[PDB]
Design a protein around this ligand. Structure first.
Ligand code: ZN
Ligand code: ZN
Lengths: 408, 143, 406, 141
């Protein structure tokens, strides 16, 4: 990688923080920073081609529609899907909600009811937990889950799927422990039961090569603002044959075919699932982000992030009292590195790091069940992106030592 | 100047003086696509040729003229050839102006080449043609 | 100052494929963006971009401030309290949110068999299809007010009874341009204890809106129609109601406690905002609200209604042109939808587009309305603060040119 | 960094006062850093005789609750409520209110937290818990 050249694309990385030091942003797991290429793609669209999409028939409408549908195609190519298999949402959370609502709809032939089991995992972000709790509540289905191993991996021996299981939802890549999950194994076990698979790919699509066809999952969700793209855009992937079978979630304009006061018929997918005006300029921005990451190459992105993670684990593990939540091993592991400091509360660790200009997230990282499973209330979490450097890792390790000295 | 390049003489002629308009019998299939169109196809006794295409509906100049032209190009044609003509029309109007179309295949159909640069009006042009393909596939299966 | 307003919008300089400068009369579908909005968002993204409502680094603090100050600026603009606004992807999602919560067993005001939902035949599909689906899911019945011959809600076409639990209606038609009698509809709704849901997508950009004063229970509007970014809509709900409502979308951010077994939920408005919000879009939309507020919405409305009056007069002076909606300016604003005898809307629209004039052609997501008047499609000219009298004249000339050409 | 982490805060953090749930009490509450906090009132209900608490949290949340107990134990109920409001105004000020050492005592040491809005909620946890438990103890009386 030409890291100096990559970092030069991000204006925010030049900023000097209140404590006088240059920003070391290690919180890309919460939201990533934006390159000029993405900022410029959206601004150029908005100042030249901004018009209604798919609703005709003047010149700006044609240009807007072209930008929208080419954006969809570019994003689909990046994640190994067909163009018609992506639905745009406001965020990944909404995408997982869409699936959870359609699976409780009487018009869907794969809808769940009493006697059916929904499976999630104890590793999951709340986005891939609460919707399944709510689906169970509305339908009388039962929620079960895989537990977590001592090294923060999905414990495959902790739950057996039987023929009651209709949905299996799981993370591709943990936003806390950094583990890469055995997708092919879980898909295999789900298929024994005839269950649909739902993949939370929010932390994989930004950090590693993703080919959704190759993974063989039924649905997948990811968010634009974590892969260098705009806020306000998420993506649901669904297999073409499944989307064809699914009733709509949100309804209104754009997603209809016929309408009377009495009833309506609905467009084909993906339009069926996109009600009202879409996030047109954000699609243009997200496509630019996909092309940016594609240009660097996701294998190179992953190799660079793995270098930083390995160094962070080494450095932090070398401090007395510091324990990693997740594996110390780099086997099937990436970003982030979440840790606890013996005798120093996460909020204080974060404050000391912030004083040095190092941004980490402190808290439960929207994975409270995971923290509770390890007897923890909060961790500090350093997450890494393509624009991060070895020096920033060193400043993390130094800041953590400083916290132990200042308090202990 | 450029308004005549989309609305060519042939299109305006077919719009004012449509051919084969009004639903007729006999027919082997009927479909409804939406500009809207109801369209019927009749095949010969042996089922090898298109003997009639009859249609009715409301729409803009481009949608009505395209259906008019469709009927002239495919009536009397063999079933496989009629489908070939449709695919050539589709390729031309969906080309964004990079494919001018072959007048040996399309006849007056080539007058819709200028529509290609206006992607919004392509669906106007394709309405009757996609309707015919549907009714042709149905009429063939019904045979 | 119209020249100074127009100088804020880069797209308005664009020369279209026919050699004519853009005359954008389709702000009803989506408005254009001033530099002030584009710059507010870009400045936020290059300086202060961090996660909101998290702990505890500096970028997080600045992001949170921008987010919550944005909510406050938007609430001031539409006469709501800060805590009474929920951000959604668009107005459609906001109307869907209400329609799903109203079928939730945990909501005390939920609808069921025997209950009636009321909408109108004037409505955009966003304020129709969610009610159809709510009725489907719950077994409640859908009824509706009809439309008068001049394109207004027909208050005599329906009597409300005690079964009516929801009354949903537009503030301002996206086709007929009519300003609806909100206070009367609210009065009538209250006689059966019904909730009111106001579609305000075309009012918030075009006229002063005070949601407290209107007395409605819920309202929806969209950012991209009031000079703001795409991907942000707003639901208003009275504080007291939001407090009683269970969540719609669930996930991170909107929870309080979580175990594998269940969860408890944050207070409103956070209860209704699941996952990462559209942070930079809130900043941009707040910038749009401050931009419109600086002009003053009374001045915006006066200017638009001048353009509309001239459009109606100009179009009415053409033989065979008929307006869908009132020819009178009484309780009427943008837009002006019309038919041209002997010329299909698609053809009208194409001739206008050749002159650089952008109008929408079709049913404008109000098919029941068009069907009520026996129409397939209309051409629709909508007017914004940045439009001029000359653009209106170009519309009239273009409609004339379409008659002569066909 | 020492401007936020005053010696006062670190002292109360390491050496917390009145920690450990005790009896008697008139109300108990639980707020979330987390704290379970009890309030005891005098026989005539006019004064706070005891504040006992327990919980896990950062230095700022623990220290603030320790400092609370020193400022409000022995105080009349309306005065204790006044002190709470003064602390709230100071930490929620963004550094534009230094706070009155006559009212707040060691509480003024949290003036430096006000510039860090993320940590304001750490500081307020014990104080808001007390305010809640005091209202409950008074109604109970
Ligand atoms: Zn047409
Ligand atoms: Zn804390």
């Amino acid at each position: 990688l030409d890291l100096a050249a990559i970092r030069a694309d991000f204006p925010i990385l030049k900023r000097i923080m209140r404590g006088g030091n240059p920003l070391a942003y290690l919180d890309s797991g919460a939201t990533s920073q934006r390159p000029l290429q993405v900022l410029d793609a959206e601004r150029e669209f908005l100042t030249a081609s901004n018009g209604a999409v798919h609703r005709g028939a003047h010149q700006l409408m044609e240009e807007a529609t072209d930008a929208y549908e080419q954006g969809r195609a570019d994003i689909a190519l990046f994640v190994g899907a067909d163009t018609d298999e992506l639905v745009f949402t406001k965020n990944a959370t909404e995408a997982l909600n869409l699936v959870s609502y359609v699976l409780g709809d009487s018009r869907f032939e794969r809808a769940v009811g009493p006697g059916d089991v929904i499976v999630t995992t104890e590793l999951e972000h709340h986005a891939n937990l609460i919707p399944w709790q709510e689906l169970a509540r509305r339908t009388g289905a039962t929620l079960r889950w895989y537990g977590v191993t001592d090294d923060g991996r999905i414990d495959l021996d902790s739950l057996y799927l039987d023929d009651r299981v209709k949905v299996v939802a799981f993370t591709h890549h943990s936003n806390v422990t950094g583990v890469l999950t055995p997708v092919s194994e879980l898909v295999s076990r789900a298929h024994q039961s005839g269950a649909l698979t739902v993949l939370d790919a929010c932390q994989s699509v930004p950090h590693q090569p993703v080919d959704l066809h190759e993974l063989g999952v039924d649905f997948a969700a990811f968010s634009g603002h974590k892969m260098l793209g705009p806020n306000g855009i998420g993506v649901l992937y669904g297999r073409r044959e499944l989307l064809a079978q699914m009733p709509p979630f949100l309804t209104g304009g754009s997603m209809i075919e016929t309408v009377t006061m009495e009833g309506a018929t609905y467009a084909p997918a993906p339009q069926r699932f996109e009600a009202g005006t879409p996030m047109t300029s954000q699609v243009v921005g997200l496509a630019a982000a996909a092309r940016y990451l594609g240009a660097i190459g996701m294998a190179a992105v992953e190799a660079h992030e793995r270098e930083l993670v390995a160094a962070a684990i080494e450095g932090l593990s070398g401090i007395d009292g510091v324990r990693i939540l997740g594996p110390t091993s780099m086997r099937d592991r990436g970003s982030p590195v979440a840790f606890v400091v013996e005798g120093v509360h996460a909020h204080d660790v974060g404050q000391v790091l912030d004083d040095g200009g190092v941004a980490v997230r402190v808290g439960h990282h929207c994975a409270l069940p995971l923290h509770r499973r390890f007897g923890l209330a909060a961790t500090a979490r350093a997450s890494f992106a393509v624009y991060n450097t070895a020096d920033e890792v060193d400043r993390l390790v130094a800041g953590v030592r400083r916290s132990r000295h200042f308090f202990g | 100047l450029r308004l005549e390049q989309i609305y060519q003489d042939v299109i305006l002629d077919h719009y004012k003086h449509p051919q084969h308009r009004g639903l007729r019998e006999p027919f082997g299939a009927q479909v409804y696509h939406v500009d809207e169109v109801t369209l019927r196809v009749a095949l010969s006794e042996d089922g090898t040729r298109v003997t009639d295409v009859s249609y009715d509906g409301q729409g803009c100049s481009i949608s009505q003229a395209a259906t008019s032209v469709l009927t002239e190009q495919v009536i009397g044609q063999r079933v496989p050839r009629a489908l070939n003509i449709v695919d050539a029309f589709t390729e031309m109007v969906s080309s964004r102006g990079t494919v001018p179309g072959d007048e040996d295949v399309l006849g007056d159909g080539v007058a819709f080449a200028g529509v290609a640069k206006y992607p919004a009006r392509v669906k106007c042009a394709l309405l009757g043609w996609m309707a015919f393909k549907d009714a042709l596939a149905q009429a063939s299966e019904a045979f």
